[PDB]
Every structure is written in structure tokens, then in C-alpha cells.
Amino acid sequence: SEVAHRFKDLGEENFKALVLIAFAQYLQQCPFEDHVKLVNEVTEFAKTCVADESAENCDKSLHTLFGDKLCTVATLRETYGEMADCCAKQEPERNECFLQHKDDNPNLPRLVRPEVDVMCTAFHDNEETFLKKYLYEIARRHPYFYAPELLFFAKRYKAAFTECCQAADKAACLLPKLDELRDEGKASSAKQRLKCASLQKFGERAFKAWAVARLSQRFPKAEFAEVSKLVTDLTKVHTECCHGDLLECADDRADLAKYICENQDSISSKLKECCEKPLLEKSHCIAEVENDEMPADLPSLAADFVESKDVCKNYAEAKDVFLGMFLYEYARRHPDYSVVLLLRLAKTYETTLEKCCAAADPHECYAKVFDEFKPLVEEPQNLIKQNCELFEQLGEYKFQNALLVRYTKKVPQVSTPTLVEVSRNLGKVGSKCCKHPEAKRMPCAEDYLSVVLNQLCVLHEKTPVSDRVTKCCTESLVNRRPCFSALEVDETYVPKEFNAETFTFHADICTLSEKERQIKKQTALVELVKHKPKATKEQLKAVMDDFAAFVEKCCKADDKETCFAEEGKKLVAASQAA
Ligand SMILES: O=C(O)C[C@@H]1c2ccccc2C[C@H]1NC(=O)c1cc2cc(F)ccc2[nH]1
Ligand SMILES: O=C(O)C[C@@H]1c2ccccc2C[C@H]1NC(=O)c1cc2cc(F)ccc2[nH]1
């Protein structure tokens, strides 16, 4: 009985929280109350199985059990409508369906967060509910969020509230802690979506390719066979989490943590304080530990991968393991390299070994391999140092408008919200990456944009509108940022003439955050660019200066939306002629 095998392995709390995530993530419009109802039933059931694994229903699959339970609520199609299809389906099709129906951008209201004392009061008046609601709200909104990490977050969310409510000033303590979690959570969700993306479209071999490069960057001193082992184990974990098997995800991640911790010596010099931490922390720690030192004096790549006379033999026995070896050997020698690049280098190799083995003479052509890299390597190098001067001039905000305009004109089919969000995240590279020296710049950007461009691809995959976006996304997972960095301004676009409510703001806007304010400013900007893509210089500064500065006028105008209904009409004439 797997349900009992999971229960006993993780325990009731995590079992209960991993379940609630499972559901939250599967029927996303469903109310908190309902899920918790469902979760305790499943809980009720598990205990029996633990108590008697022979009992009536304890042999079914976890999907089966969770699927029947879920569909108790989903069945209504006046409330839901589209998930009730998955209900009439049986396994394994029912699970395929729920996963297909996972909505990366769900039309959901934001929890206007109440004052600090009420949260504190709620936290004490009943925390068990309070904390359940944190898993629920994040899961709902992040249907691919790495669940076993989402628990690690929860514990930390619990800790903040217990510290900060008892503190003299409850707000100055709590608010910074919360916002730190939020950010740390948005990066996590994003990073995790890339893994599910990779796994479910480009197959595991591609995920495998990514981890081996990554783990070997981190664990250079480890053997190759020791890295493949870890890679395989990781893959089964992410496969399982990205397939909705969250319970065995948590278990298998836990096994690996223990495994790593028991062979510390054979894997890394740098895991001492990581592997002394408790359950949940232990895995977050290990995952994000620092790069180990490089084994004294290493040989050249060439000898094995070039100068040797038995490439094709080692290739043709098993090209995957060989290419895995190259991916190992190349990466352990270069922690200063981006992982997308390396994957781009290794692929040149794969293709070139099929070009050269297929000849009568193997050697002559593949001796020239390590020139073919120089241009692939220099392409990312040039783009990053080009944008960074262009950033420190403008600042994170101004520099996001430079992106907005560009990507807007580049791909005007896309929805303004998508454009606004992706370009807002794309320019955040300039903050975290240009800050470094070159020794860590180019890589930093190139890898971050890998995450931010996936966001674009999965948001566009929802409702396709463009021809070119759907290309860069589906053509080759690692060739993405250079693919979007080869799309010129389009000449096909038929622009929508005028939309008067887009550029006329309101008095609700004088009661919201600077971030939200910025996001409004920028939405209007995108949609103005959407009016004239062709001849349009900096001048988009001025009229955006106006739609932003005139806000200052009307906020500090002490009226009942009089000036908004006329002094905004002054500017629609300003944005057409000029
Ligand atoms: O060629 C592909 O697109 C599939 C995968 C890919 C992805 C990027 C760069 C190279 C390659 C080659 C290809 N994967 C592998 O060759 C491969 C990696 C790998 C890692 C291991 F720990 C054990 C065996 C392995 N085989
Ligand atoms: O995969 C994990 O959850 C943790 C992995 C781990 C564990 C111990 C030491 C180092 C590391 C690195 C850490 N994996 C990654 O960073 C990683 C990123 C990433 C992005 C992809 F698009 C596809 C596969 C990927 N793996």
C-alpha cells in the first residue's frame, strides 16, 4: 500500500501539507475550506491503511485515491466546467488531464493583506489554519512550485510570525521577513517551472544534461559515476514533482539529502554545516551551497575528446554516457561558465561526432572542435557587457522601459500584461548581474534570462498569439535567448488605432504601491508603443513623462475625479499629434 508507505515515511504533518498542495495545485479555483475538508478525509483514510494495509481501498494508486477525492468537488461544471472532463476520465488519462489543465496565470484575486496585529491575532487564535492557508495560497497560484521546498518556506513563514508578533514593534519585524520570503518564493517558482518545462517538452535527457553540468560545477572533485548517480536521482525527483506525484517527490528528495550527507567526503568538501541542519532546511541548504575547489592540476579536454584515437568507439557504445562525460569534464573545469552555453557547446560536439564518424577519416574534422566554441562563447559575452553600460546609465526602472519598448516592438502580438511582467523581470538582470565583475557577469545574466524567458514561453503557450514566440520556445530549449535575440522588429503587424481608457488614469491609482504604480505607468507605455511600432524615437519618454507626471498633478489635486475626467483628455491629443 503506497498511501501507507508514504504516510509513515513523511509523517502526518508533511503528508497533510503535501496533500493540500496536491489538491490546491489541481483544482485551483476551489475554496480553501473545501480542500481542507478533502485533505482530512484522505488523512482519515491513510491512518486506517497504516493500521490495516489489507483494508478495502489501500491498494489503489495515489493518483486514483487523490483523483476520486478531488473529483468530488470538481464534478460541478456550473462552478468549474473544464476539469469535470478529467473526472469522467480514468487513470492514467485523468492525471494527464489535471496536469494539462494546470494554469500558470490564474484569474484570481490578491489577498489584500490585513494589518500586522490582526495577522498576529489570527496566528494565535488558530495558527494551524493560518499556516494551512499559506500553503494553499502559494500552491493555487504556483501549480508547479517545488512542493517539498514550499514546506521549507512555510516553516520559515511560521517562524517569522512567532518572532515578530512577540516583538515590541510587530510591523518593522514582520514586513521585511515576509517580503524576503515572497521574493525568495518567486525566484523558486520560476526556477522550478524551467525544470518542469525541460522535463515535459524536451525529455529527461535534456534535464539530465542540465543537472550533470550543474552538479559537476558544484561538485568537481566527485567522480563522473558519482555525478550520474546524483543526476539520475534528482531526475526521478523532479519528474515526480513535475508529474504531480508530490508525496514520493518529498520522500525521494529526502532520500537523496540523506545519501549526499552520508558520502559528504566523496562528493564535496563544502557540505559540513549543510548536512547538520534539520529535515527541511537540509535540502534547501545543500541545493544552494557554494562551488567546491578544483582538484589540483587537471589534464586537457582534448586528449580524451580529440587527440585520442577511439572517440567513435566510445561514442558508438553509448553516446549519452560519453556526452555525459564531456558535460562532466568540461563543466568541472569551468564554474565561470553558464549552463545554457555549455549545453550549446556539448551539442556542437554531438553533431560534429555524427559528421566526422560518418566520414572515411574521423580525426581531421573533429580536431577543429575547440575553435567552433569561440564564437558560441563570445556571443553571450558581448550581449551582457553591452546591456550593462546601457543599464547603469538608466537605472532598473528606466532600463525596464528600454526593454518594454524593444520587446513590445519585437513581438507586438503578445498580451500587454505578459509583456509588462516579462520585461520587468528581464531587466531585473541588470540589478543582480551587472553588480558583479565580468568573472561572474555574462554567466549570471545568460542563466537568469533562461528562467525569465521560460516564464514568457509558458505564459504564451496558454493562449498563443504570435508565430515567432511559439518558435523560439519550441525549437530548442537552450537556443532560446539567442533566438529572441535574433528577432528583428516586425513589419507584419496591423496596429490597433486608439484606445482612450488605456491612457486615462483614476483616483484609485493614488492609493496603491509604487510598484503597482510603476506597473500601471508601464502598461500604458506598452499600449502606446502598440499604437506606433515604426518611426518612434525617445519621444515615447515625453508622452510617458506626461501620463506619469500628470498623475502628480491630480493626486495632489484635492478633488472628486474632476481633473481625471478632463486633464487626462488634454493628454490624448498630446499623444497622437506628438
Ligand atoms: O541533445 C539533446 O538536446 C539531448 C541532451 C542534451 C542537451 C543539451 C546538451 C547536450 C545534450 C545531449 C543529451 N543528453 C546527454 O547526452 C546526457 C547527459 C547525461 C548526464 C548524465 F549524468 C548521464 C547521462 C547523460 N546523457
Ligand atoms: O535540482 C535540485 O533541486 C538541486 C540541485 C543540486 C543539488 C545539490 C547540489 C547542487 C545542485 C544544483 C541543483 N540543480 C539546479 O540548479 C538545476 C537547475 C536547473 C535548471 C534546469 F532548467 C534544468 C535542471 C536544473 N537543475
XYZ file of C-alpha atoms and ligand atoms in Angstrom:
630
model
C 0.000 0.000 0.000
C 1.724 3.152 -1.243
C -0.540 5.551 0.671
C 0.642 3.983 3.963
C 4.221 3.728 2.690
C 4.179 7.496 2.135
C 2.347 8.407 5.377
C 4.848 6.530 7.536
C 7.821 7.853 5.614
C 6.998 11.579 5.710
C 4.677 11.657 8.733
C 1.204 13.211 9.181
C 2.050 16.920 9.065
C 4.001 16.842 5.803
C 1.674 14.176 4.392
C -1.241 16.532 5.205
C 0.606 19.571 3.742
C 1.835 17.770 0.611
C -1.691 16.519 0.041
C -3.245 20.082 0.426
C -0.656 21.289 -2.072
C -1.522 18.396 -4.406
C -5.160 19.455 -4.431
C -4.616 23.217 -4.279
C -2.456 22.819 -7.410
C -5.019 20.607 -9.246
C -8.337 22.420 -8.726
C -7.111 25.952 -8.392
C -10.442 27.833 -8.286
C -11.569 25.583 -5.403
C -12.035 27.301 -1.953
C -9.625 26.689 0.979
C -12.437 25.309 3.106
C -13.273 22.609 0.570
C -9.727 21.376 0.128
C -9.034 21.147 3.847
C -12.263 19.122 4.010
C -10.919 16.787 1.319
C -7.434 16.601 2.895
C -8.664 15.351 6.278
C -10.772 12.633 4.590
C -7.666 11.437 2.807
C -5.954 11.741 6.185
C -8.736 9.768 7.855
C -8.202 7.083 5.197
C -4.406 6.856 5.445
C -4.433 6.045 9.099
C -6.670 3.037 8.562
C -4.248 1.766 5.887
C -1.323 2.262 8.268
C -3.473 0.416 10.808
C -4.527 -2.275 8.258
C -2.920 -2.221 4.772
C -5.210 -5.099 3.658
C -8.271 -2.846 4.231
C -10.819 -2.212 1.471
C -9.114 0.528 -0.621
C -5.471 0.734 0.472
C -4.020 -0.894 -2.672
C -5.160 1.772 -5.155
C -2.757 4.266 -6.718
C -2.199 7.624 -5.037
C -3.405 9.308 -8.186
C -6.515 7.098 -8.047
C -7.178 7.968 -4.406
C -6.408 11.688 -4.876
C -8.256 11.790 -8.241
C -11.540 10.314 -6.911
C -11.382 12.671 -3.922
C -10.621 15.736 -5.995
C -13.395 14.993 -8.466
C -15.963 15.042 -5.614
C -15.843 18.845 -5.855
C -14.640 19.291 -9.449
C -17.635 17.361 -10.849
C -19.819 20.509 -10.879
C -19.494 22.297 -14.240
C -21.570 25.369 -13.254
C -18.672 26.146 -10.873
C -15.689 24.567 -12.626
C -16.605 23.422 -16.169
C -13.339 22.253 -17.739
C -11.826 19.993 -15.015
C -15.005 17.833 -14.888
C -13.711 16.426 -18.198
C -10.781 14.924 -16.249
C -13.342 13.387 -13.884
C -15.068 11.180 -16.459
C -11.565 10.034 -17.448
C -9.933 7.210 -15.530
C -6.210 6.794 -14.763
C -3.651 7.361 -16.235
C -5.597 9.747 -18.552
C -7.303 11.539 -15.633
C -3.883 12.606 -14.295
C -2.628 13.712 -17.717
C -5.735 15.902 -17.831
C -5.342 17.662 -14.432
C -1.672 18.357 -15.367
C -2.704 19.693 -18.794
C -5.238 21.911 -17.075
C -2.677 23.445 -14.671
C -2.992 27.157 -15.191
C 0.202 29.216 -14.822
C -1.745 32.512 -14.786
C -4.988 32.069 -12.874
C -7.675 34.778 -12.827
C -7.504 35.021 -9.005
C -7.979 37.897 -6.545
C -4.997 39.008 -4.460
C -5.227 38.646 -0.689
C -5.258 42.256 0.382
C -3.105 41.592 3.465
C -4.534 42.974 6.730
C -2.652 44.930 9.392
C 0.099 43.267 11.381
C -1.813 42.819 14.666
C -4.752 41.019 13.009
C -2.427 38.569 11.300
C -0.791 38.113 14.734
C -4.184 37.714 16.339
C -5.241 35.162 13.678
C -1.847 33.417 14.077
C -2.578 32.871 17.798
C -6.366 32.452 17.565
C -5.635 29.475 15.308
C -2.236 29.034 13.650
C -2.903 25.504 12.325
C -5.450 27.080 9.929
C -3.290 30.197 9.469
C -0.347 28.150 8.196
C -2.531 25.818 6.081
C -3.742 28.972 4.291
C -0.109 29.920 3.371
C 0.482 26.611 1.567
C -2.948 26.888 -0.039
C -2.493 30.429 -1.412
C 1.004 29.846 -2.809
C 0.106 26.442 -4.324
C -3.056 27.788 -6.014
C -1.036 30.497 -7.649
C 2.038 28.389 -8.385
C 0.797 24.996 -9.695
C 4.458 23.879 -10.397
C 6.048 25.280 -7.190
C 8.517 22.678 -5.892
C 6.295 21.409 -3.056
C 8.942 19.953 -0.722
C 10.541 23.431 -0.774
C 7.117 25.062 -0.283
C 7.114 23.343 3.122
C 10.591 24.714 3.881
C 9.058 28.156 3.181
C 6.061 27.513 5.454
C 8.237 26.691 8.464
C 10.063 29.964 7.851
C 6.716 31.783 7.452
C 5.646 30.239 10.768
C 8.872 31.384 12.415
C 8.522 34.981 11.245
C 5.092 35.326 12.833
C 6.181 33.764 16.127
C 9.153 36.109 16.357
C 7.582 39.295 15.075
C 4.276 39.267 16.951
C 6.046 39.000 20.304
C 8.497 41.761 19.232
C 7.949 45.312 20.526
C 7.350 46.733 17.026
C 5.495 43.919 15.285
C 5.465 45.512 11.795
C 9.094 46.500 11.375
C 9.984 42.908 12.208
C 7.364 41.054 10.204
C 7.071 43.040 6.985
C 10.705 42.706 5.910
C 10.760 38.978 6.715
C 7.564 38.444 4.635
C 8.791 40.346 1.602
C 12.070 38.345 1.793
C 10.015 35.127 1.572
C 7.864 36.420 -1.252
C 10.954 37.246 -3.418
C 12.720 34.024 -2.432
C 9.451 32.299 -3.500
C 9.046 33.977 -6.919
C 12.600 33.014 -7.886
C 11.881 29.451 -6.696
C 8.640 29.054 -8.582
C 10.355 30.405 -11.706
C 13.426 28.147 -11.366
C 11.087 25.131 -10.812
C 8.929 25.916 -13.873
C 12.064 25.657 -16.055
C 12.646 22.118 -14.746
C 9.083 21.022 -15.490
C 9.308 22.838 -18.793
C 12.535 20.999 -19.683
C 11.236 17.658 -18.490
C 7.813 17.641 -20.136
C 8.744 19.086 -23.579
C 12.441 18.307 -24.161
C 12.632 14.988 -22.283
C 14.764 13.968 -19.311
C 17.964 13.571 -21.288
C 17.789 17.367 -21.548
C 17.034 17.822 -17.848
C 19.808 15.265 -17.230
C 22.127 17.335 -19.378
C 21.360 20.395 -17.264
C 21.855 18.839 -13.835
C 25.091 16.957 -14.655
C 26.575 20.257 -15.806
C 25.250 21.982 -12.732
C 26.128 19.367 -10.067
C 29.598 18.923 -11.599
C 30.158 22.669 -11.487
C 29.342 22.412 -7.791
C 30.986 19.024 -7.048
C 34.094 18.996 -9.238
C 36.110 16.569 -7.087
C 33.358 13.950 -7.328
C 33.880 11.215 -9.898
C 31.730 11.023 -13.014
C 29.885 7.865 -11.902
C 29.119 9.643 -8.613
C 27.621 12.611 -10.518
C 25.474 10.465 -12.854
C 24.067 8.723 -9.771
C 23.056 12.040 -8.241
C 21.746 13.258 -11.615
C 19.548 10.182 -12.063
C 18.166 10.521 -8.512
C 17.453 14.230 -8.976
C 15.674 13.470 -12.285
C 13.290 10.960 -10.639
C 12.561 13.590 -8.005
C 11.797 16.421 -10.420
C 9.932 14.030 -12.788
C 7.758 13.047 -9.840
C 7.171 16.575 -8.554
C 6.502 17.802 -12.143
C 4.037 14.883 -12.698
C 2.083 15.636 -9.525
C 3.483 12.729 -7.519
C 4.352 15.172 -4.734
C 4.367 12.608 -1.879
C 7.064 10.374 -3.380
C 8.815 13.549 -4.542
C 9.217 14.594 -0.908
C 10.336 11.081 0.048
C 12.866 10.738 -2.773
C 14.259 14.222 -2.236
C 14.647 13.262 1.423
C 16.486 10.041 0.475
C 18.966 11.970 -1.685
C 19.586 14.512 1.041
C 20.472 11.637 3.383
C 22.536 9.997 0.609
C 24.549 13.138 -0.067
C 25.046 13.651 3.675
C 26.438 10.137 4.194
C 29.061 10.367 1.382
C 29.970 14.027 2.023
C 33.695 13.181 1.644
C 33.185 11.561 -1.781
C 31.004 14.429 -3.077
C 32.294 17.688 -1.593
C 34.498 19.404 0.948
C 31.849 22.120 1.418
C 28.790 20.368 2.943
C 29.764 20.151 6.669
C 27.289 22.735 8.046
C 24.642 21.854 5.421
C 24.253 18.233 6.498
C 23.992 19.101 10.221
C 20.721 21.004 9.675
C 17.195 19.560 10.340
C 14.820 17.803 7.878
C 13.512 20.563 5.575
C 16.418 23.007 5.827
C 18.935 20.260 4.990
C 17.793 20.107 1.332
C 17.400 23.869 0.697
C 20.915 24.297 2.122
C 22.676 21.555 0.076
C 20.940 22.738 -3.114
C 22.363 26.256 -2.827
C 25.784 25.569 -1.236
C 28.936 27.145 -2.800
C 31.190 25.750 -5.565
C 33.942 23.394 -4.335
C 37.658 23.863 -5.072
C 39.041 22.349 -8.255
C 41.193 19.178 -7.993
C 44.857 20.359 -8.136
C 46.184 20.030 -11.728
C 43.720 18.802 -14.338
C 44.501 17.432 -17.809
C 43.123 18.745 -21.096
C 39.743 18.086 -22.648
C 41.438 17.316 -25.949
C 43.227 14.037 -25.088
C 40.013 12.078 -24.374
C 37.686 14.123 -26.605
C 40.051 14.902 -29.529
C 43.620 13.572 -29.539
C 42.575 10.011 -28.674
C 42.010 7.505 -31.460
C 38.838 5.896 -30.038
C 36.153 8.597 -29.999
C 33.757 6.786 -32.369
C 34.158 3.540 -30.373
C 33.380 5.299 -27.052
C 30.702 7.353 -28.832
C 29.045 4.375 -30.550
C 28.991 2.169 -27.426
C 26.742 4.738 -25.705
C 26.797 8.375 -26.903
C 24.705 9.558 -23.954
C 27.188 8.430 -21.275
C 30.054 9.756 -23.441
C 28.355 13.141 -23.926
C 27.558 12.997 -20.212
C 31.297 12.532 -19.613
C 32.163 15.534 -21.823
C 29.489 17.528 -19.998
C 31.139 16.428 -16.709
C 34.743 17.075 -17.715
C 34.109 20.402 -19.427
C 31.980 21.742 -16.577
C 34.164 20.786 -13.548
C 36.923 22.872 -15.202
C 34.621 25.895 -15.681
C 32.448 27.193 -12.812
C 32.628 30.642 -14.513
C 30.528 29.331 -17.452
C 26.760 29.479 -17.988
C 24.987 26.152 -18.117
C 22.995 27.026 -21.273
C 26.281 27.810 -23.074
C 27.924 24.528 -22.025
C 24.826 22.704 -23.297
C 25.299 24.686 -26.539
C 28.994 23.661 -26.674
C 28.254 19.984 -25.938
C 25.630 19.929 -28.697
C 28.092 21.232 -31.257
C 30.200 18.216 -30.208
C 27.302 15.717 -30.578
C 26.514 16.897 -34.072
C 30.206 17.112 -35.041
C 30.807 13.478 -33.916
C 27.990 12.422 -36.306
C 29.601 14.436 -39.137
C 33.107 13.069 -38.505
C 32.347 9.392 -37.661
C 30.264 9.320 -40.882
C 33.366 10.266 -42.914
C 36.070 7.845 -44.020
C 38.536 9.865 -41.939
C 37.368 10.745 -38.414
C 40.224 12.822 -36.979
C 40.863 15.776 -39.315
C 37.495 17.499 -38.835
C 36.983 16.964 -35.079
C 40.479 18.254 -34.297
C 38.968 21.671 -35.113
C 36.249 21.410 -32.395
C 37.624 23.972 -29.936
C 37.572 26.815 -32.474
C 33.811 26.256 -33.112
C 33.277 27.148 -29.442
C 34.961 30.585 -29.541
C 32.043 32.235 -31.380
C 29.355 30.483 -29.306
C 31.236 31.619 -26.214
C 31.785 35.217 -27.452
C 28.143 35.772 -28.447
C 26.826 35.786 -24.818
C 29.956 37.681 -23.687
C 29.225 40.622 -25.992
C 25.450 40.972 -25.249
C 25.840 41.249 -21.448
C 28.610 43.868 -21.352
C 26.600 45.805 -23.984
C 23.389 45.975 -21.909
C 25.201 46.745 -18.602
C 26.598 50.131 -19.645
C 23.103 50.698 -21.022
C 21.717 49.854 -17.531
C 23.899 51.787 -15.027
C 23.050 54.893 -17.079
C 19.298 54.426 -16.845
C 18.644 52.533 -13.595
C 16.467 49.449 -13.057
C 13.260 51.335 -13.871
C 14.306 53.386 -16.929
C 16.161 50.306 -18.247
C 12.938 48.230 -17.956
C 11.228 50.749 -20.283
C 14.069 50.300 -22.759
C 13.210 46.579 -22.722
C 9.464 47.155 -22.777
C 9.629 49.291 -25.947
C 12.026 46.784 -27.576
C 10.278 43.522 -26.847
C 6.967 45.283 -27.487
C 8.045 46.296 -30.960
C 9.835 42.964 -31.348
C 6.700 40.849 -30.536
C 3.576 43.106 -30.534
C 1.074 40.209 -30.799
C 1.639 39.340 -27.085
C -0.676 40.487 -24.294
C 0.356 43.669 -22.509
C 0.313 42.091 -19.045
C 2.664 39.349 -20.257
C 4.912 41.952 -21.906
C 4.875 44.112 -18.785
C 5.775 41.233 -16.460
C 8.410 39.534 -18.596
C 10.206 42.795 -19.453
C 10.017 43.824 -15.787
C 11.777 40.542 -14.889
C 14.149 40.634 -17.909
C 15.620 43.983 -16.820
C 15.982 42.819 -13.219
C 19.066 41.021 -14.590
C 20.788 44.416 -14.655
C 20.429 44.622 -10.888
C 21.783 41.225 -9.780
C 24.229 40.556 -12.645
C 25.995 43.838 -13.602
C 26.704 44.289 -9.869
C 29.374 41.555 -10.192
C 32.685 41.744 -12.124
C 32.920 40.046 -15.558
C 34.297 36.887 -13.867
C 30.628 36.302 -12.918
C 28.621 38.715 -15.189
C 27.916 37.049 -18.562
C 27.097 33.707 -16.977
C 24.809 35.351 -14.350
C 22.660 37.081 -16.988
C 22.538 34.287 -19.539
C 21.321 31.792 -16.887
C 18.807 34.200 -15.314
C 17.245 35.065 -18.697
C 16.880 31.289 -19.195
C 14.408 31.347 -16.295
C 12.732 34.631 -17.289
C 12.258 33.545 -20.939
C 10.637 30.267 -19.904
C 8.106 32.365 -17.990
C 7.342 34.025 -21.360
C 7.060 30.699 -23.168
C 4.666 29.045 -20.670
C 2.520 32.234 -20.484
C 2.354 32.416 -24.253
C 1.689 28.639 -24.508
C -1.562 29.375 -22.637
C -3.136 31.450 -25.412
C -0.889 31.573 -28.493
C -0.972 34.881 -30.403
C 2.430 35.105 -32.063
C 4.141 32.971 -34.678
C 7.707 33.740 -33.653
C 7.401 33.416 -29.861
C 5.982 29.893 -30.255
C 9.045 29.218 -32.478
C 11.849 30.387 -30.166
C 10.137 28.410 -27.404
C 9.653 25.074 -29.206
C 12.730 24.991 -31.498
C 15.490 24.260 -28.925
C 15.383 24.779 -25.156
C 18.949 26.149 -24.797
C 18.939 28.195 -28.048
C 16.222 30.477 -26.647
C 17.766 33.793 -25.565
C 19.862 33.976 -28.779
C 16.649 33.139 -30.719
C 14.723 36.025 -29.172
C 17.970 37.995 -29.658
C 17.685 37.419 -33.425
C 14.080 38.583 -33.956
C 14.125 41.975 -35.626
C 11.296 44.492 -35.422
C 8.318 43.020 -37.333
C 6.769 44.521 -40.459
C 3.619 42.352 -40.477
C 1.757 43.964 -37.592
C -1.611 45.688 -38.027
C -1.762 48.096 -35.057
C -4.960 48.916 -33.124
C -5.596 52.612 -33.732
C -6.757 54.256 -30.476
C -7.999 53.130 -27.053
C -8.885 56.178 -24.899
C -9.355 54.453 -21.489
C -5.857 52.948 -21.539
C -4.205 56.346 -21.094
C -6.714 57.961 -18.723
C -5.864 57.041 -15.127
C -8.015 57.271 -11.935
C -8.184 58.259 -8.226
C -7.816 54.599 -7.234
C -4.263 54.940 -8.568
C -3.459 57.421 -5.731
C -3.886 54.654 -3.102
C -1.538 51.901 -4.318
C 2.144 50.953 -4.088
C 4.961 52.457 -6.103
C 5.483 49.032 -7.725
C 1.804 48.820 -8.733
C 2.007 52.471 -9.814
C 5.036 51.600 -11.997
C 3.193 48.589 -13.428
C 0.334 50.944 -14.417
C 2.688 53.526 -15.886
C 4.337 50.750 -17.921
C 1.088 49.102 -19.086
C 0.052 52.424 -20.632
C 3.557 52.742 -22.193
C 3.381 49.299 -23.855
C -0.036 50.024 -25.257
C 1.196 53.376 -26.649
C 4.087 51.562 -28.321
C 1.378 49.190 -29.595
C -0.111 52.189 -31.463
C 3.087 53.156 -33.395
C 5.847 50.455 -33.683
C 7.661 52.050 -36.657
C 9.047 55.641 -36.529
C 9.082 56.432 -32.786
C 12.279 57.754 -31.140
C 12.898 58.616 -27.455
C 9.693 60.740 -27.789
C 7.933 57.840 -26.010
C 9.708 59.292 -22.963
C 7.893 62.663 -23.161
C 4.278 61.456 -23.564
C 5.058 58.799 -20.926
C 6.599 61.616 -18.860
C 3.206 63.316 -19.251
C 0.951 60.321 -18.395
C 3.224 59.787 -15.331
C 3.852 63.366 -14.203
C 0.223 64.492 -14.689
C -0.602 61.859 -12.048
C 1.331 64.063 -9.590
C -0.983 66.915 -10.593
C -4.245 65.036 -9.932
C -3.256 63.037 -6.822
C -2.267 66.306 -5.142
C -5.386 67.969 -6.648
C -7.889 67.525 -3.783
C -10.932 66.747 -5.938
C -13.528 64.066 -6.705
C -12.033 62.866 -10.015
C -12.756 66.134 -11.851
C -9.288 66.589 -13.401
C -9.070 62.879 -14.246
C -12.154 63.306 -16.487
C -10.708 66.341 -18.384
C -6.978 66.995 -17.722
C -6.453 63.390 -18.889
C -8.393 64.296 -22.066
C -5.788 67.043 -22.587
C -3.117 64.349 -22.986
C -4.880 62.107 -25.559
C -4.487 64.997 -28.016
C -0.830 65.240 -26.923
C -0.151 61.503 -27.609
C -1.489 61.405 -31.213
C -0.098 64.565 -32.857
C 3.200 64.384 -30.936
O 20.829 16.771 -27.478
C 19.907 16.966 -26.718
O 19.128 18.075 -26.875
C 19.629 15.977 -25.608
C 20.602 16.074 -24.419
C 21.441 17.327 -24.403
C 21.047 18.600 -24.057
C 21.983 19.618 -24.098
C 23.297 19.359 -24.485
C 23.676 18.071 -24.829
C 22.724 17.077 -24.772
C 22.913 15.644 -25.103
C 21.693 14.963 -24.438
N 21.966 14.399 -23.097
C 23.091 13.645 -22.791
O 23.910 13.428 -23.643
C 23.375 13.077 -21.465
C 23.605 13.798 -20.320
C 23.844 12.944 -19.286
C 24.117 13.202 -17.961
C 24.326 12.122 -17.120
F 24.590 12.347 -15.830
C 24.254 10.812 -17.639
C 23.975 10.579 -18.989
C 23.769 11.676 -19.808
N 23.485 11.765 -21.128
O 17.786 20.083 -8.650
C 17.765 20.478 -7.353
O 16.714 20.607 -6.775
C 19.033 20.742 -6.598
C 20.315 20.600 -7.436
C 21.549 20.449 -6.594
C 21.742 19.605 -5.514
C 22.968 19.619 -4.858
C 23.975 20.470 -5.287
C 23.764 21.314 -6.373
C 22.542 21.295 -7.013
C 22.134 22.109 -8.188
C 20.609 21.920 -8.194
N 20.007 21.904 -9.525
C 19.969 23.010 -10.356
O 20.420 24.085 -10.037
C 19.302 22.918 -11.639
C 18.805 23.991 -12.324
C 18.206 23.546 -13.454
C 17.580 24.237 -14.457
C 17.061 23.477 -15.490
F 16.460 24.099 -16.480
C 17.163 22.077 -15.521
C 17.808 21.414 -14.477
C 18.327 22.175 -13.442
N 18.987 21.807 -12.328
